[PDB]
Each structure stands twice: as structure tokens, then as C-alpha cells.
Amino acid sequence: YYDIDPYKEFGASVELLSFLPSDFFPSIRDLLDTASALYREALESPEHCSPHHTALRQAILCWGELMNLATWVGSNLELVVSYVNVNMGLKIRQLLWFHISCLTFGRETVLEYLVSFGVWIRTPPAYRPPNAPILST
Amino acid sequence: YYDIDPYKEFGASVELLSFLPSDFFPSIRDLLDTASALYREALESPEHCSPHHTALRQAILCWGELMNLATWVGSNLELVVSYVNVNMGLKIRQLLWFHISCLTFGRETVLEYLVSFGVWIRTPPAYRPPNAPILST
Amino acid sequence: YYDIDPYKEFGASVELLSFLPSDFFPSIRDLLDTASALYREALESPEHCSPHHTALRQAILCWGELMNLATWVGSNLELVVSYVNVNMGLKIRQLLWFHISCLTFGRETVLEYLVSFGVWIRTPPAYRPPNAPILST
Amino acid sequence: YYDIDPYKEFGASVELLSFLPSDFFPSIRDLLDTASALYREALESPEHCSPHHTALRQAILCWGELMNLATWVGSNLELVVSYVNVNMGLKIRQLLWFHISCLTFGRETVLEYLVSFGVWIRTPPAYRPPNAPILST
Amino acid sequence: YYDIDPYKEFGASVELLSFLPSDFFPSIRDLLDTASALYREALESPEHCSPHHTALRQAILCWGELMNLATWVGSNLELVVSYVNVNMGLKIRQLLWFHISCLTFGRETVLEYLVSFGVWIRTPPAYRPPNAPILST
Amino acid sequence: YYDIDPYKEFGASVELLSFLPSDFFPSIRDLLDTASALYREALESPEHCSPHHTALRQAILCWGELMNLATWVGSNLELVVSYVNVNMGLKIRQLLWFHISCLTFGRETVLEYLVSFGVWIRTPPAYRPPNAPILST
């Protein structure tokens, strides 16, 4: 009945993030592995240091209950995974990637990185520099 | 693939929510209508006013995408809505009711209200003081 | 052999609590669940803190051993069990109720409440208030 | 229902029992008589002399309750009794022996005594000291 | 049994280094020869100096024992050996490479280099720079 | 390839092993259990408590790797296993026993203990003390 911006409170819009191509976002298993390996103690810490940690906490709990629902559906079925994994992935990948990426790098440098990426990709391939993607800080 | 507590802001004791019977909590429609009519303006272009606002907005968003999934399942069926809520509603109710209640009342009054109600229900039914509802302030 | 009063160091006597009728004390399951859900961290703390915290530990341990005894008796079997249960039911209810109640409220007000209850029950039923006094604060 | 460490404040009873063999502990009636011939009056004092004292008197009360149960079972029987005696014998003997031994000697010397005993028993019998008994002080 | 992360005290995790492909790490023979020819005096020094110096000693000792195991298996014989070699090849390569690299360069820059490599590899191959980032200074 | 002294910083393992007989060391699983029942949590701490601690945890990781190899060999075999168990048993038992024993007791008392044991064993059996075991402290 209602719709809200996941990203506005951080200063980003759905249009801005959706500007990036869908295929660029990597898989989910590796993303979860990275997040866990980096912040097993941080996400489970008693104190809520930053809003990003909290937000990704409810996000990962949502994915956990959702995959639990998927398993329950598979057990109670009477192709099913094919249509559903993509339609959640095209959101969860963005969500998890944004919080973990903005957790480092300051959370602002991500904005200039994405705007430069959009400028680069809006250009036709007739003339195009070969080194677009994110730097390392 | 991992087990993390949804609550850490002193609500990590899921057993506290488990003590209260499931039937006690209200239905989804009433809570949604109350939250909408009471914080439609609050949950629109906000700042990091309080982590509760965040947690509840991601909660309503994830519920919204569950409902989008359910509606698309109904549009692409070949009972379906009957069994899914049997779990999903129980999870979401204990998820969001705490946040919406503790948003007012200070966030601590809910704690002793909860423990007092647990004591009251633990008391024998034969000798029961007349009532012990929620007290606003 | 020779028996020793447990409550005498606290300041009460077994027969003092013996005045309370059996139905007054709630179910053992609810009492155990309440104590666990309220002070799991305190019981599992490496600090003894209050002596009542210590006493509850061995009380829970011996009752857990008693269920082991019941399980072993049942296993050997393939009435008596009910009588064994109701034997220690009153005693464990007295001990657990006293310790749980006195853990909060300061441990003094329990004494006045119980002595007032003794006054109430010693009075013949004809000349009694319609309701019995209940614990406050 | 739950597995609770007996004395995590006092070391950790599980592994410390694990080092010692079960048969090392003496007969239960010998332990009872030894404690009795020492401290009949000390326990019955109306003061919490030590949390350790409260724990041990609660333990002996539990022992008396268990003996009352055994007497009733024998009186109302209609081989198992021997396994009842040796079943809790490890647990109750551990608790009682620990309390009696650590009541004197400072309550810390038991730790190094038992670790030395573990070192001694772990040593193969090819070369082993003839005896590693308790040391008085 | 229960496993313990070796790098966790240093500040890294096993799965963090697990991102690196097998071909990235050089031959074990060259690594061993390099370490020996660079710090023979340090390894043979009677002073432990850095804890990494200690760790490398037992790593070399256990690998030397592993060649002894291979020699004994071959002697008993008169495929399997290749599989056994390639099993520990990745692990010893990770350990030796990490310790050797962190011995110089300060031990911090390795962390940024590896996290940047993880960022690089998580990116799909299409949107990558022509070359991978390389260690500097 | 090369012969490296295991612990030249810690005395010199070669001759100190040479004094002691091979069979003096206990069974490997007893040593593992003894270390485990003591210091499960201490090892997993994210801090280099002692270089000795790092060495012993690396050693136990090597032990786990060796056991994984043994399990794979048994699963993929197509008498030798016994000599595998007793072959490294001297070396691994030396390392583990040394680390466990010298972790406590100050880490220097082991030197005089072993030299006294060497004096005792060098004594002919015509006149020899009945026992020269470890001394607790």
C-alpha cells in the first residue's frame, strides 16, 4: 500500500543507484562471505555504533527468513527458484553492496565513484577509456 | 547460513517476546494503519532521528516485498496465502510491535510493562488480580 | 538424621511458609521459565552476586537431576511418578517462589506480606475480607 | 531443559571432574559423617557465614530429600536401587567432596591439587610416582 | 574437532586470503629458498625477535616432516602423493607467503593490498582494469 | 632440505629430548584433551598472549592437519597406520607436552626437572630412587 526510499536517509535515491547496470553487481554468496568475514563481531556487537550496521542486520535477517521461506516452499511445492532468486537478487545485491562498500571509504567517495561510472557508461563505446571501475583507498 | 539475533537494543532476549502468547499481539491491518496514520510525515525525507525509525522502515519495506511476492504468486499460481502468514505474521508481529510501541513511552517503560505482564500471567489463574493492561504516559 | 532450616539464615522458617495453601503457588514450569527468561545472564554470569543467585543454581541442578531420576525410573519400568512429583512440588515451589520474589522487591517486603497472609488465613473464613492481600511494589 | 555449569564461579566443575576418575571419591556416608563430626553447629548458625556454606547446606538438604525418596521407594517398591546409589553418587560425591575439601585449606589449593593429580594420572605407568594423595596444611 | 584461525591474532581470516586464486601464489620451492637465503641468520638466531620468525620455524619443521611422511609412504609402496601434495600446497603457500610478505613492508600494507585484490576479483571480469593491482613499496 | 633446531630460543630441544626416553610421553589424545579442558577460550582470543601460545596453537593446527590427512588416507587406503601414529608421536608429543607443561610452572622449571630426570635415569638400577616424577607448584 506504501512505498519508501531505502536509500534516502543516507542521501541516495533509487534512480541514482539503479543507474548502474544490473550485471555489474556480483553474486550473493561471496557478498555474504565477505560481510561475515569482515564483521562477524561488529554486526553481533551489543552496541549499535552506526546506522549502517543496524540496517544491514535487519537486511541479513530478512534474507535468512526469506531463504527459510524458500526452503519451506520447496518442501511444500505440491523453475520455482529461477524466477524468484533473480527478483530478490536485483534488490538484495544492491542493498548489501551499498552498505558494506559505504562502510569503508567514508560513504561519500562511493557517490563520486558511482557518478563517474554513470558518466563513463553514458558515453558510447566509439571512444571510451579502458579503466572505468572503482579505485582502492 | 548463519544465526543472528534481530534485536540488540536490550531486546536481544527473544525469550521475552516468547513469554507473551502469540494471540496477544494485534493484527497486521491495525498496526499498519496506526503506523501509517501516525508517522506518514515522519517517515518521509527524514534524517537519522532515531535508529527505531530506520529499523521500522526497513521492516515495513521487507514486509512490502513479501506482499509483492505473495501478490505475484497469486497472479502466477499455476491456500497459497493461508499457510505463509502462519509463520510470516508471527515473525513480523514480534518484530515491529516492539518498535512501534517503544517509539513512544520512552523505550524503557515497555520493558517493565513486559516483565510485569509476564509475572501477572505466571501467577495462578485461581488467584489473579483483576487486570494488568498497558499504561501509557 | 538431623535436618537444617534453609530459610533460617535468610530470616524465615519452613513452617512459616507452610501456611500457604498448595493452590496459591503457580505451576513449576512457568516459574522455571520466568526465572530463566529473566536472569539467564545473571545465572550464567561468572559472578555469584547475591547468595540467592547461588542457591537457585543448585536448586535448578537438583531438580534437573530429579527429572533424570524420573526418566531412569520410566526406562526401567519398560501413580508412583505422580506421587513423587507432588511430593517435591510443594517444597520446590516454596523455595523457587521465595527466592524469585525476594530477588526483586528488596527481600524485606516478602516477610510482611507473608506474615499478613498468615494473619489472614488464621482468621476463620467468616470474618475475612472478600479478597486476600496481594503483593505490592 | 537446560545445561547449567554447577560452579563457574568456582573454576568449572565439568572438566575438573573429568580429570579425576569417578572411583576416587569415597563413600557418601563417610563424607556425611566426616562433615557432621566437624561442623554440626557451624551449619545451624543463623548467619550466612559464606556463600560456599549456603551451597553446601543446600546440597546436604538435597541429599536428605534424596534419601527420603529412596526410603519411600524402598517402602513402596511395588537391583535398580544399586544403580540409583551409584548414579547420583558421582555428582553428589563431587559436590560434597569439593565443598568439604575446599572449605578448609583456603579453597584455592584444591585447584592445583587436582591439576597435579591430572598430570600424575596422565603420566603412563612405565614411570609413575607411587602416590599423589591430598596434602594437609 | 574444533579449529582455530591462525591469522585472527595477526588481524586476518583464512577465508579472507581464500579469495586469491591458486595460480597467484608462486612455487613452494622458490618461496622456501627465498626465505632461507634471506633470513638464515635470523631463523638460526637464538632470539625469537618477531613472532612471525617463531611461526615460520614450526611451519618449516612441519613441512619437513611432511616430506618425511611422503618418503615413508613411498618406501612402504615398494596419484595419491600428488593429491596429498596439492592439498597442503594452497595452505602452506598462504601461510608462507603471508609471513614472508608481512615480515617486510611493515605488515600493514599487506592488508590493504589483499582487500583491494578482493574488491578487484569480486568485480565481474568485464568491468576490470587490464591488469590487477600489485604490491608496492 | 635443511636441519633446523626447533627451539634454540627455548633451550635446545634435541639433547633435552635425548635425555628423556621416548615412551615417557603420554598418549596424544590425552594431551589434546588435557589442553582442551584447560584453555579452549584462551587460545581463541584475538591477541598474541605469548609467543609460546602462538607456537602451540600453530602446533595444534598442524596436528589437526595431520589428522585430516590420516582420515583421508584411511578413507582412500587403496599396519602402516600404526607406524604413522608412532612415527610422529615422538616429535608431536615432545612439542605438545613441552608446550603444555612449560605454559604453567613458569617455563623454566621444566629445564631443571628434565635435567634431574636425566640424572635419575643415568643412575644404575643397583641403587635408584623409586620415582622421579613431575613436581606440581
Residue numbers in the entry:
A (entry chain C), B (entry chain D), C (entry chain B), D (entry chain A), E (entry chain B), F (entry chain A): 49 to 126, 253 to 311
Passage from the reporting paper:
In order to solve this problem, we designed new HAF constructs with short linkers. Even if each linker was composed of two residues, it was confirmed that the construct could assemble into capsids. HAFS was self-assembled into a spherical capsid form, and the assembled HAFS was collected using sucrose gradient centrifugation. The 3D reconstruction structure of HAFS was also obtained, and the final resolution of HAFS (T = 4 state) was 4.41 Å. In the cryo-EM structure of HAFS, the capsid part of HAFS had the same size and shape as that of HAF or HBcAg. When the threshold was lowered, the affibody density protruding on both sides of the HAFS spike was clearly visible. Each spike is composed of HAFS dimer, and the affibody density protruding from the HAFS monomer consists of a pair of affibodies coming out of and back into the spike. In addition, at this threshold, only the affibody of HAFS, which consists of three protrusions in the three-fold axis, was observed. The full affibody density perfectly surrounds the HAFS. As a result, the affibody density extending from one spike to the left and right is more clearly visible. From the above results, it was confirmed that HAFS formed a spherical capsid and the affibody density was much more clearly visible than in the case of HAF.
